Design a protein around this motif. Structure first.
Motif, PDB file in Angstrom:
ATOM      1  N   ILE A  49       0.697  -0.658   0.067  1.00 39.17           N
ATOM      2  CA  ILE A  49       0.148  -0.222   0.100  1.00 39.17           C
ATOM      3  C   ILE A  49       1.053   1.222   0.305  1.00 39.17           C
ATOM      4  O   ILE A  49       0.442   2.325  -0.618  1.00 39.17           O
ATOM      5  CB  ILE A  49      -1.216  -0.214   1.277  1.00 39.17           C
ATOM      6  N   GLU A  50       1.742   1.598   0.395  1.00 38.91           N
ATOM      7  CA  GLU A  50       2.650   2.403   0.558  1.00 38.91           C
ATOM      8  C   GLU A  50       3.667   2.528  -0.634  1.00 38.91           C
ATOM      9  O   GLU A  50       2.877   3.929  -1.058  1.00 38.91           O
ATOM     10  CB  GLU A  50       3.906   2.108   1.347  1.00 38.91           C
ATOM     11  N   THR A  51       3.558   2.182  -1.416  1.00 34.21           N
ATOM     12  CA  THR A  51       3.967   2.077  -2.783  1.00 34.21           C
ATOM     13  C   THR A  51       2.949   2.492  -3.874  1.00 34.21           C
ATOM     14  O   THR A  51       3.111   3.537  -4.459  1.00 34.21           O
ATOM     15  CB  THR A  51       4.646   0.561  -3.919  1.00 34.21           C
ATOM     16  N   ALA A  52       1.899   2.199  -3.680  1.00 36.06           N
ATOM     17  CA  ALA A  52       0.125   2.224  -3.999  1.00 36.06           C
ATOM     18  C   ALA A  52       0.250   3.854  -3.982  1.00 36.06           C
ATOM     19  O   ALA A  52      -0.891   4.733  -4.744  1.00 36.06           O
ATOM     20  CB  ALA A  52      -0.998   1.754  -3.841  1.00 36.06           C
ATOM     21  N   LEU A  53       0.146   4.349  -2.871  1.00 38.81           N
ATOM     22  CA  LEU A  53      -0.427   5.594  -2.360  1.00 38.81           C
ATOM     23  C   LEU A  53       0.549   6.171  -2.490  1.00 38.81           C
ATOM     24  O   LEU A  53       0.387   7.719  -3.607  1.00 38.81           O
ATOM     25  CB  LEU A  53      -0.086   5.519  -0.533  1.00 38.81           C
ATOM     26  N   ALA A  54       2.187   6.381  -2.974  1.00 39.68           N
ATOM     27  CA  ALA A  54       3.386   7.207  -3.528  1.00 39.68           C
ATOM     28  C   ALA A  54       3.386   7.324  -5.010  1.00 39.68           C
ATOM     29  O   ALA A  54       3.143   8.198  -5.551  1.00 39.68           O
ATOM     30  CB  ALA A  54       4.359   6.681  -3.075  1.00 39.68           C
ATOM     31  N   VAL A  58      -0.270   1.610 -11.889  1.00 41.29           N
ATOM     32  CA  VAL A  58      -1.973   1.021 -12.510  1.00 41.29           C
ATOM     33  C   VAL A  58      -1.822  -0.691 -13.135  1.00 41.29           C
ATOM     34  O   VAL A  58      -2.393  -1.912 -13.071  1.00 41.29           O
ATOM     35  CB  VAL A  58      -2.137   1.178 -14.392  1.00 41.29           C
ATOM     36  N   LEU A  59      -0.442  -1.168 -13.028  1.00 41.24           N
ATOM     37  CA  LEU A  59       0.045  -2.520 -12.761  1.00 41.24           C
ATOM     38  C   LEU A  59      -0.580  -3.196 -14.102  1.00 41.24           C
ATOM     39  O   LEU A  59      -0.928  -4.690 -14.005  1.00 41.24           O
ATOM     40  CB  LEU A  59       0.014  -3.219 -11.647  1.00 41.24           C
ATOM     41  N   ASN A  60      -0.845  -2.891 -15.260  1.00 43.49           N
ATOM     42  CA  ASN A  60      -0.653  -3.498 -16.612  1.00 43.49           C
ATOM     43  C   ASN A  60       0.057  -3.808 -17.295  1.00 43.49           C
ATOM     44  O   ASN A  60       0.612  -2.995 -16.501  1.00 43.49           O
ATOM     45  CB  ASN A  60      -2.014  -2.997 -16.568  1.00 43.49           C
ATOM     46  N   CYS A  61       0.042  -4.850 -18.160  1.00 46.37           N
ATOM     47  CA  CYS A  61       0.643  -5.086 -19.717  1.00 46.37           C
ATOM     48  C   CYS A  61       0.754  -4.461 -20.417  1.00 46.37           C
ATOM     49  O   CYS A  61      -0.730  -4.517 -20.907  1.00 46.37           O
ATOM     50  CB  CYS A  61       1.284  -6.753 -19.422  1.00 46.37           C
ATOM     51  N   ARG A  62       1.313  -3.597 -20.515  1.00 50.09           N
ATOM     52  CA  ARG A  62       1.381  -2.223 -22.037  1.00 50.09           C
ATOM     53  C   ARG A  62       1.993  -2.547 -23.098  1.00 50.09           C
ATOM     54  O   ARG A  62       2.203  -1.337 -24.019  1.00 50.09           O
ATOM     55  CB  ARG A  62       1.174  -0.587 -21.570  1.00 50.09           C
ATOM     56  N   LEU A  63       2.915  -3.957 -23.336  1.00 46.40           N
ATOM     57  CA  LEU A  63       3.627  -4.046 -24.760  1.00 46.40           C
ATOM     58  C   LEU A  63       2.275  -4.512 -25.696  1.00 46.40           C
ATOM     59  O   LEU A  63       1.417  -5.628 -25.751  1.00 46.40           O
ATOM     60  CB  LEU A  63       3.887  -6.061 -24.389  1.00 46.40           C
ATOM     61  N   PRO A  64       2.691  -3.537 -26.566  1.00 45.20           N
ATOM     62  CA  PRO A  64       1.357  -4.252 -28.135  1.00 45.20           C
ATOM     63  C   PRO A  64       1.164  -5.482 -28.185  1.00 45.20           C
ATOM     64  O   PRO A  64       1.908  -6.433 -28.570  1.00 45.20           O
ATOM     65  CB  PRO A  64       1.839  -3.594 -29.572  1.00 45.20           C
ATOM     66  N   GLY A  65       0.087  -6.463 -28.406  1.00 41.34           N
ATOM     67  CA  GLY A  65      -0.129  -7.384 -28.342  1.00 41.34           C
ATOM     68  C   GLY A  65      -0.386  -8.058 -27.202  1.00 41.34           C
ATOM     69  O   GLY A  65      -1.046  -9.787 -26.880  1.00 41.34           O
ATOM     70  N   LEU A  66       0.213  -8.219 -25.960  1.00 36.65           N
ATOM     71  CA  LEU A  66      -0.018  -8.165 -24.551  1.00 36.65           C
ATOM     72  C   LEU A  66      -0.660  -7.971 -23.692  1.00 36.65           C
ATOM     73  O   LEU A  66      -0.610  -8.630 -22.448  1.00 36.65           O
ATOM     74  CB  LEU A  66       1.707  -8.381 -24.275  1.00 36.65           C
ATOM     75  N   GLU A  67      -1.170  -7.032 -24.084  1.00 33.03           N
ATOM     76  CA  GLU A  67      -2.343  -6.301 -22.930  1.00 33.03           C
ATOM     77  C   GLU A  67      -3.216  -6.889 -22.130  1.00 33.03           C
ATOM     78  O   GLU A  67      -3.785  -6.883 -21.310  1.00 33.03           O
ATOM     79  CB  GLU A  67      -3.225  -5.108 -23.350  1.00 33.03           C
ATOM     80  N   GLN A  68      -3.523  -8.432 -23.131  1.00 30.42           N
ATOM     81  CA  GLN A  68      -4.602  -9.412 -22.377  1.00 30.42           C
ATOM     82  C   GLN A  68      -3.904 -10.052 -21.268  1.00 30.42           C
ATOM     83  O   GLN A  68      -4.491 -10.988 -20.313  1.00 30.42           O
ATOM     84  CB  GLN A  68      -5.336 -10.643 -23.881  1.00 30.42           C
ATOM     85  N   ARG A  69      -2.813  -9.979 -21.380  1.00 30.18           N
ATOM     86  CA  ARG A  69      -1.659 -11.162 -20.296  1.00 30.18           C
ATOM     87  C   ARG A  69      -2.038 -10.118 -19.485  1.00 30.18           C
ATOM     88  O   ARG A  69      -0.843 -10.536 -18.540  1.00 30.18           O
ATOM     89  CB  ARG A  69      -0.364 -11.733 -20.799  1.00 30.18           C
ATOM     90  N   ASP A  77      -2.699  -4.373   2.146  1.00 30.76           N
ATOM     91  CA  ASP A  77      -3.355  -3.502   2.560  1.00 30.76           C
ATOM     92  C   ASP A  77      -3.962  -3.783   3.699  1.00 30.76           C
ATOM     93  O   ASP A  77      -4.905  -4.282   3.922  1.00 30.76           O
ATOM     94  CB  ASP A  77      -4.097  -2.430   1.428  1.00 30.76           C
ATOM     95  N   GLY A  78      -3.073  -3.641   4.804  1.00 36.00           N
ATOM     96  CA  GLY A  78      -4.073  -3.845   6.458  1.00 36.00           C
ATOM     97  C   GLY A  78      -5.436  -3.088   6.702  1.00 36.00           C
ATOM     98  O   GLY A  78      -5.520  -4.348   7.355  1.00 36.00           O
ATOM     99  N   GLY A  79      -5.029  -1.863   6.422  1.00 30.81           N
ATOM    100  CA  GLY A  79      -5.900  -1.486   6.868  1.00 30.81           C
ATOM    101  C   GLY A  79      -7.061  -1.059   6.253  1.00 30.81           C
ATOM    102  O   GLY A  79      -7.846  -0.142   6.171  1.00 30.81           O
ATOM    103  N   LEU A  80      -6.990  -1.628   4.622  1.00 30.57           N
ATOM    104  CA  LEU A  80      -7.910  -1.164   3.997  1.00 30.57           C
ATOM    105  C   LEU A  80      -7.471   0.072   3.113  1.00 30.57           C
ATOM    106  O   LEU A  80      -8.720   0.572   2.807  1.00 30.57           O
ATOM    107  CB  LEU A  80      -9.292  -2.025   3.503  1.00 30.57           C
ATOM    108  N   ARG A  81      -6.724   1.234   2.785  1.00 30.03           N
ATOM    109  CA  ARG A  81      -7.088   2.367   3.192  1.00 30.03           C
ATOM    110  C   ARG A  81      -6.833   2.241   1.404  1.00 30.03           C
ATOM    111  O   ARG A  81      -6.395   3.533   1.044  1.00 30.03           O
ATOM    112  CB  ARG A  81      -5.243   2.897   3.653  1.00 30.03           C
ATOM    113  N   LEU A  82      -6.917   1.699   0.589  1.00 24.16           N
ATOM    114  CA  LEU A  82      -7.116   1.726  -0.551  1.00 24.16           C
ATOM    115  C   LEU A  82      -7.808   2.821  -1.543  1.00 24.16           C
ATOM    116  O   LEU A  82      -8.804   3.040  -1.263  1.00 24.16           O
ATOM    117  CB  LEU A  82      -6.804   0.597  -1.861  1.00 24.16           C
ATOM    118  N   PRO A  83      -7.077   3.451  -1.580  1.00 22.03           N
ATOM    119  CA  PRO A  83      -8.377   4.869  -2.481  1.00 22.03           C
ATOM    120  C   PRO A  83      -9.025   4.550  -3.559  1.00 22.03           C
ATOM    121  O   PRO A  83      -8.341   4.396  -4.314  1.00 22.03           O
ATOM    122  CB  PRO A  83      -7.035   6.437  -2.917  1.00 22.03           C
TER     123      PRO A  83
END
Lengths: 212, 213
Positions: A49-54, A58-69, A77-83
């Protein structure tokens, strides 16, 4: 237990970030492509969560043709602190997002994230070894950990890393403002052997595997 | 002595090619992307003349934003049989092409390839792989990607010059009638290698190995 790959982005002087902030940017084209390939080969990408806040990633794959992977995403996130405004939560219908918290987080943040499309993942004490047993029971064969100092230190200290990939920026941050992963070099010395080293200074990479 | 990665594309029954035509094509998107990133990570991509003749390859990096990182191409070609019509030779301005020769090949084919843009690489014969890699290290080469057909794959593996082995596996069967295998591959893996990662998905399957030492 899934295979665990820990991917770290370091500066030229070995820092994992600037004090109070997010991750070190990796800019070489070979390293960026390899970085997205690791995501496509993983069943799960895990961050803290520290990384997510800072970084609001998005953590997706953006190579063309690999987005479906694009893999399942897991946020520790121990406290369910995700915005609910995070890029993560707002893409939760288009890519799986699992938020790991135990029997401690309040039901109102538990309910708001679930209604937005997050699966809520139950965890013990945060117990990394049987989070990986839990993740494996749900069909996961390989986890890619993209750590800041917290997740990287905890996975290495508990000796749960099978492969370590370190991308090093050519830029120096400085010990005045840099954050390091403490114990990183001693863990590599003690437990890991180098596999490949890419030496272009704008595109530097080191891969290690756990000792036999 | 540079790091050597051997990349093999095999069929379901373990053939690296078929006698009358080209090699096993890799079709999975993750395997395709990884194949071109290996090229980008390599200083040199090395193949044998038999693959060159059978497949008329190009051996460049076709990932967008990485095409400028297409490595130098090296063809092991003792008799300088590489056609000047080859896509390789006809690509000489856009990507380096070195053709490796014995001390013996006629000077006539050395000049013709020179005029087409190829560097001719002098090597020692018996064609000595250990000495070729020392020569390559002497020219600053830090890593070699070998995309072997059976000939070079068997030769690098027999003389124990492979540090990492990457095997992409097609779900299709080639057959014993026309299939060519890498002879001794499975015993070399049992004897000298450990599995490092495996992607089991059938339309995009891959296994990577590292040498035990």
């Amino acid at each position: 237990r899934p295979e665990v790959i820990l991917k770290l982005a370091l500066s030229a002087d070995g820092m994992i970030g600037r004090k109070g902030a997010g991750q070190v940017a990796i800019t070489g084209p070979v390293s960026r492509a390899q970085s997205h390939i690791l995501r496509a080969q993983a069943d799960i990408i895990l961050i803290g969560i520290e990384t997510a806040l800072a970084d609001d990633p998005v953590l997706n794959c953006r190579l063309p043709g690999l987005e479906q992977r694009s893999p399942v995403r897991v946020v520790l996130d121990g406290g369910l602190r995700l915005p609910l405004s995070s890029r993560l939560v707002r893409s939760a219908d288009t890519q799986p997002l699992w938020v790991a918290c135990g029997e401690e987080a309040p039901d109102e943040r538990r309910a708001a994230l679930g209604a937005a499309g997050c699966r809520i993942l139950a965890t013990e004490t945060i117990a990394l070894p049987e989070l990986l047993d839990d993740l494996a029971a749900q069909g996961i064969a390989s986890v890619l950990v993209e750590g800041g100092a917290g997740v990287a230190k905890s996975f290495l200290d508990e000796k749960l890393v099978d492969r370590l990939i370190i991308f090093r920026s050519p830029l120096v941050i400085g010990a005045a403002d840099g954050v390091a992963v403490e114990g990183l070099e001693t863990h590599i010395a003690s437990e890991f052997k180098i596999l490949r080293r890419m030496r272009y200074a704008d595109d530097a990479c080191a891969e290690y595997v756990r000792n036999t």
